[PDB]
Structures are given as structure tokens and as C-alpha cells.
Amino acid sequence: DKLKKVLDKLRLKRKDISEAAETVNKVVERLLRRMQKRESEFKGVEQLNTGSYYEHVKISAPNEFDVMFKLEVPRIELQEYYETGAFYLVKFKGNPLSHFLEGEVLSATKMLSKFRKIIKEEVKEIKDIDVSVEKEKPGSPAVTLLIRNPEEISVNIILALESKGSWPISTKEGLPIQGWLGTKVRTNLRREPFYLVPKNAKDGNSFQGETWRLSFSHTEKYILNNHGIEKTCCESSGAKCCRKECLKLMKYLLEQLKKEFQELDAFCSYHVKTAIFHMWTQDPQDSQWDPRNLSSCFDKLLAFFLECLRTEKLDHYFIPKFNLFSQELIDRKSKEFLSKKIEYERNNGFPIFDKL
Amino acid sequence: KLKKVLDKLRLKRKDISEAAETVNKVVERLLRRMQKRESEFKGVEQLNTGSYYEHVKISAPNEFDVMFKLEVPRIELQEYYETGAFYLVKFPLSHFLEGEVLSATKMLSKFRKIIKEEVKEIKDIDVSVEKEKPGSPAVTLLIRNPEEISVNIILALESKGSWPISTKEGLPIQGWLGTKVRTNLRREPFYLVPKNAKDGNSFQGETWRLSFSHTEKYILNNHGIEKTCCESSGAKCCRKECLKLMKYLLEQLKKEFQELDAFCSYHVKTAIFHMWTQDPQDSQWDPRNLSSCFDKLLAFFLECLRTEKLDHYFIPKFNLFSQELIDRKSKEFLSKKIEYERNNGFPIFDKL
DNA sequence: ATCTGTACATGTACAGAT
DNA sequence: ATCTGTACATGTACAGAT
DNA sequence: ATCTGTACATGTACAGAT
DNA sequence: ATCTGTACATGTACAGAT
Numbered sequence A: 001d002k003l004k005k006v007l008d009k010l011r012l013k014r015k016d017i018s019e020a021a022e023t024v025n026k027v028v029e030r031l032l033r034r035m036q037k038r039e040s041e042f043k044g045v046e047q048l049n050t051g052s053y054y055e056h057v058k059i060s061a062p063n064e065f066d067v068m069f070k071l072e073v074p075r076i077e078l079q080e081y082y083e084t085g086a087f088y089l090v091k092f093k094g095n096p097l098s099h100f101l102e103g104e105v106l107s108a109t110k111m112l113s114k115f116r117k118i119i120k121e122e123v124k125e126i127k128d129i130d131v132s133v134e135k136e137k138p139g140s141p142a143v144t145l146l147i148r149n150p151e152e153i154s155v156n157i158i159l160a161l162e163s164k165g166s167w168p169i170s171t172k173e174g175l176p177i178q179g180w181l182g183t184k185v186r187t188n189l190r191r192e193p194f195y196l197v198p199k200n201a202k203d204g205n206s207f208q209g210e211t212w213r214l215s216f217s218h219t220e221k222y223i224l225n226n227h228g229i230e231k232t233c234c235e236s237s238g239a240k241c242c243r244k245e246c247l248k249l250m251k252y253l254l255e256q257l258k259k260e261f262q263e264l265d266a267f268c269s270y271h272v273k274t275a276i277f278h279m280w281t282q283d284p285q286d287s288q289w290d291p292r293n294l295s296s297c298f299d300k301l302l303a304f305f306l307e308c309l310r311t312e313k314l315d316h317y318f319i320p321k322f323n324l325f326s327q328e329l330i331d332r333k334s335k336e337f338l339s340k341k342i343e344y345e346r347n348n349g350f351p352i353f354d355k356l
Numbered sequence B: 001k002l003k004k005v006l007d008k009l010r011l012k013r014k015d016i017s018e019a020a021e022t023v024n025k026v027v028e029r030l031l032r033r034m035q036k037r038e039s040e041f042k043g044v045e046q047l048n049t050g051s052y053y054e055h056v057k058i059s060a061p062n063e064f065d066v067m068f069k070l071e072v073p074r075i076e077l078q079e080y081y082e083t084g085a086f087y088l089v090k091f092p093l094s095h096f097l098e099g100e101v102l103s104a105t106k107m108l109s110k111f112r113k114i115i116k117e118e119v120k121e122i123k124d125i126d127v128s129v130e131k132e133k134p135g136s137p138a139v140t141l142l143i144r145n146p147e148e149i150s151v152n153i154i155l156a157l158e159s160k161g162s163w164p165i166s167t168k169e170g171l172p173i174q175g176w177l178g179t180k181v182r183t184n185l186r187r188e189p190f191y192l193v194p195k196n197a198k199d200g201n202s203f204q205g206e207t208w209r210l211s212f213s214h215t216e217k218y219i220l221n222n223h224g225i226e227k228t229c230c231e232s233s234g235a236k237c238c239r240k241e242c243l244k245l246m247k248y249l250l251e252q253l254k255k256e257f258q259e260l261d262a263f264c265s266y267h268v269k270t271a272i273f274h275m276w277t278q279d280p281q282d283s284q285w286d287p288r289n290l291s292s293c294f295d296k297l298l299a300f301f302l303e304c305l306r307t308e309k310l311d312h313y314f315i316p317k318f319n320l321f322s323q324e325l326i327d328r329k330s331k332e333f334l335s336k337k338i339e340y341e342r343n344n345g346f347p348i349f350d351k352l
Numbered sequence C, D, E, F: 001a002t003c004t005g006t007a008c009a010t011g012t013a014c015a016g017a018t
Ligand SMILES: Nc1nc2c(ncn2[C@@H]2O[C@H](COP(=O)(O)OP(=O)(O)OP(=O)(O)O)[C@@H](O)[C@H]2O)c(=O)[nH]1
Pocket: A050, A051, A052, A053, A057, A058, A059, A064, A066, A214, A215, A216, A217, A220, A251, A268, A269, A270
């Protein structure tokens, strides 16, 4: 109860899912077409639907869709950027990517800028949908579309490189799903390709325009939809669990707080997604996520997340040495501020869940 | 106890390597011949199946099952007399047709002639082609490493369509392995093998039988309700050991008594599939409860015998214990001999 | 004449709707 | 509890290309 | 189209620990 | 007696090269 009513509020409506997906699929399909037309450099790119809507943890409204446009790049050499584990330079062995080359090195911002120019041109030609292109955001690997379905919808077209080689060594000790999803699943997932998206920092740091960042959105999608230690978890002949509902409630808490308070700008939903992947590793049994224990299940996730904030440690699930909560990324000011806001909501009935 | 019997049944690492190097030598050479030649089975691929590749072979690595699978599009199927598993096939292979009917006997016999020719050319291994068992879908090789090793080479057609409607209700794993696993498995191809021998009551020679050896192998190696069952970071179960004990009990009874000729290890494999479905939780197969697990398997197999009903796990209407397949007499004999061993501490488990 | 990238045809898990 | 729209994986048809 | 290279599942074999 | 850790061995998926 009580948290069940919040989830009722957060539950997406099928009427809205239809209207939104109808428009979104028309726009995405046309953009994917134009990428294959001509001697375009992005010929061959394939679509991958990712993120919370395709993991079924989108909340409130179907107003934001992530879609990777992924391009296989056969012979590629990687160079780690300053032992960060997550950031790389790409290098190469006629070739469509040549215009973005900078002496062996693939420029991310050069690729993205031409990707984006092509997108904007195609968008000019959509005459039956109110759709434009958001101004570029620092740090975004995406070209974001703003659709007015009347209702506002964002579509993030994420540009990605696809390598089918084995994953970079910095992930060797990531994905610690052995006690939970098991060794066969882990091995099979690491047989899948890995992905590189533009870092696009705009900070002024050296190599800024040529650094890429690993993405595991496809793996995360598989894990969200195959999340139980039992194969029948949340299936029609198995037992429902509350894992996704805890992720929804945590996402909602952060979203509500983030739109009230500018102090929380450095925080994003990927921080809560990473924290709950750790909780799912720490508590692997499906019975540690009984729907009847939704309150304490949510409560123990808060407690884990507060400890991550207090101790300033939230390791990337796929790249253990990459701390999303380091000082270099988020001030202790920000963290103590969110720690107190969460602490407050937790001990006063979650008044922010009733906001708006 | 049963632990001690399981130590006996366990294969030796040295034996596995000595047997497999020889077997792989012959098999690659045979698979090469169907391939690098202008043969009508150009295309076949190797599919290793059965107990050795499922890690439930017992006593010795002395029998190997290999599918040579050949893809065929269109391949319209017609069911044989509502039996479920038996079909005629319709429409390189035109040499084996009759009246738009693909004759299993005619394709097997050329398949067999090919293998015999290639076997005559192997001069580095003592290997011969066993006399054909009429019906049987296999061409069987006998190898004397020095040890005797059978290699059954099973001709199969591979089809990519929806599985035939007689399986629609089979593979009832939804509460054990789940719906996603079942749907994924039924997205795999299905196989037909040239199993014949209906004495001489005709249609005999053009019949094929459905094979699910590929699905069974996936199940054997992905058998828990938890994904970690028998993995290095999960808990061991005793499901496979129970299958081994049951196989050995029938193996030992069949050596003794010719009354049990109609019985085969597949009857045991089918029965334990049903019991794994009845008892899906991994905790119902705890290693510490090996005995009661073996016993409840015994009691289910006896119930199958008593009721004369052991449905094909993939084809529910096909009763492997029908009066037409196994005489009522044979099933009461097997009942009495199993009840005997059970009630006396399994003496046959001691004898050599 | 034959070949094939594109898209339709089929089936079902997920989860919202009634 | 059943009915149902979307997403998605795989099998296959054929208009347009060679 | 074929075949090697790699990674890790699944097994057995045995000493040291429990 | 059983459990545990390391070593030893085959099977099998698939990327990448030719
Ligand atoms: N490695 C890495 N991945 C990120 C990061 N931020 C976002 N992602 C990925 O981006 C995808 C979508 O990002 P978001 O739109 O912000 O959040 P979401 O998962 O779609 O959830 P919603 O906010 O409800 O849309 C996820 O599938 C993540 O895998 C990051 O900082 N590092």
C-alpha cells in the first residue's frame, strides 16, 4: 500500500503509449532510412532501442525514448584515456569514415557534427509532425528531437560505434552477475558487441573532441528484462518480484527532487540504475524482492544509495575502477545536499511523491 | 552408497581423451567427405548429441551420437496416422524422391553407401561399419581404439518453420525453465530422422521421425530453475546423477534379461524430464537427498509402467508405453524386477 | 531469366485494460 | 481473470536490380 | 566457404583443509 | 568422511582472416 498508489500514478497509459510510439517510430524509421540513402558515411548503421521505455521502467508519461544508431567499425585499435577505464581514443588499421579521420584517430565531434547535420536536414522535410532538433547539450552523445504530439516528446538518437571484439580489459571484473544471473549468462553477454559513444565534454581538456565513452545499454536492457535468479521471475507461470518497481520509485524520487532543486544538476537517473544493479547483486534471491516487502525493499535501496553518497563511492557496474561519485565529478556539497533531501523524504512520509 | 555407485559410473579423464581424439578423427573425415565432394549431402553440419555430450554418459566413453543435419526449404510435412512423431516429407535430393515423397530409406541408403566407401579409405584406425539394423536412423561405426567404441552417425533433415502442431502442447517447461526459454527453444529448427521399421506394414520406407536431441541437450545443460544451478557460483543439484543411476539400473537389468529388449535409455530420459517438470525447484534435487530423489524417480517410473503411460515429452499424444509398442507382459516384468532391486538395496549395483 | 535487400508474416513476453 | 497493443525475433516474398 | 584463435563452460584427479 | 582449490582435458560459440 501507499507505495502501490504511487506506482499507480507512475504507470503509463496504453492510449498514450500508442500515440507516442506511433509518431516516434515514424520519425526514427525515416531518419534510419536517410542514413542508408546516398554515399552517406553512416550507411550500414542499425537501430537499437534502449533505455527505460524499452526496459519498461519509464514512469509518468512516455515522453522520452532512447535509440542507438550503431555503426560497426571492423579493424579498430583502442587507447585508454589516462587510465579512466571508460574513455578511449579510436584508431584505424577507401573508407566512408575517412572525412572524420585526424591522422589515424577518429574524431568523435567531427562524426557527431555530420551525423547531426544530416539529421537536421531530414527533420526539415518532415511536414506532418511538429518535430525539431534540440540545441546541442554538453556531454551528450545524442541528437535529441523535440516532438509536439501535442504532448512534448524527446527522442535521443545516440550515435555509437559497434565493435564485435572482446570487451576492453577495464571491464574484466565488471558485470559481477555470477552469483545472481550466473556464469553462462555472463559469458554470453560478454560475447555480445560493445559500444562507444562520444564523450563530448566541451570542458577544454586535452583530446576533448576525440574521446569516446563505453556504453553497455544493450546489456543493461537484457538484464532489466531477465532480472531474476529464477528463470520464471515475473513470467506468467512464475512469481512476481518488485525489482523494477523499486527502480521506478527511486527514479521518481530523483526526478521530483531534480526539478525542484538546481543543486542536484550533477545527478542523473543512471546513478540510481547503477546503485540498484549493485543491490540486485548484493541481494540476488528473488525472495529478497517479494512484492509484499516493497516498502523495506525500497527502504534498503535508499539506505544503500545514502551510503554511496556519504562514502562518495558509486562504482560503474561495468567498469569497476570508474567511480561515478568521485570528487572530480560531484562536489561533496551536492552529495550532502541530496543525502539530506533523501533523508528528509524518507523520514516524513515521502511528501514529494504527492507533489504536482 | 549411491555415491559409491556414482564413483564407479564416472568416466576417466584419460579414457575420454583417448576415445575422443579417435572419434573426432573419423567424424571430421566423414563430414569432410559429404562436403568437399559433389555429393547430394553437400551442406550437412555436425551436431553432437546424446549422453556423452550431455555429460550423463556412464561407465566408459564407448558410445557417441553425431547428427549430420541437412537444411531443406519448403519441405511440406504430412502426419502419419495421427501418431505425432511420424511424417512423410514432400516438396540435389531428387534422386531420393518417389511421388513428390522424400523416401527416408532411399536417402539413408546412399548416405550409408557414402560412409562405407570413406571408411574403406581409413588406414590409421581400426574402424568398420556395423551391419545395418533395419529401420534405425543411424549408420553405426565400430572403432577398436583398442577399446570398443560405437559412433552412431544420424542423418537428419533440419527445418526452420514453426514446429509441427503435435508439439504445440509438448515441452511443458513454463513453470520450470519458463516461457522465454520455451519460446526461444521453439524458435530453433526442428529435426526429422529416417527412423523406419514398421515390420512390413508399409508407408514404412518413406517415414521420418521427429528428433529433439538439440533441445534435450540444451535442457540437460540448462536444467535448473535458478540460472546458477551447478555453475561455479551456484549450488550443485543431483538431477544428472539421478539420471545416471536410473540409466545404470536399466542398463544392468537389460544385460541380464532379454525380456527387457523393448526398453531403452530414452524411456528413462523421458521419465526424468517429466519428473524434472513435476519437481522444478532446485531444492527438490539437493545433493544431500540423492536417495529419496532416486527413489521418487523409481516410484514415478513404476507408476508409468503400472499405468502403461509414458508420453513423449515433446509430443504429448505419443505414448511410448502403449500396448502396441511394449507388451503389457514386458512392463510387468520390468516392474517386478525394479521393485525387487528397490526393496533389497539394489544388489545389481554391485555385480560387474 | 535469376538474385536479394527490404519489408511483410507469424508468434508471444510484457504489462496495461477491462 | 482474460483481453490486448507494442516490441521483437525470426522466417520468408518479391519488386527492382543484375 | 573454411579454418584457426580465443574464452570459458563443462567435466575428471588429487592434495590439503575441514 | 566430505569439502575446497588448483591443475588438466574436451566441447562449443563465434570473431576474424583468408
Ligand atoms: N556508461 C554510461 N551510460 C549512461 C550514462 N548516462 C546514461 N547512460 C545510458 O543511457 C541510457 C538512457 O539514459 P537516460 O535517458 O538519462 O535514462 P533512462 O535509462 O532512459 O531512464 P529515463 O530517464 O526515464 O529515460 C541508459 O540505457 C544508460 O545505459 C553515463 O553517464 N555512463
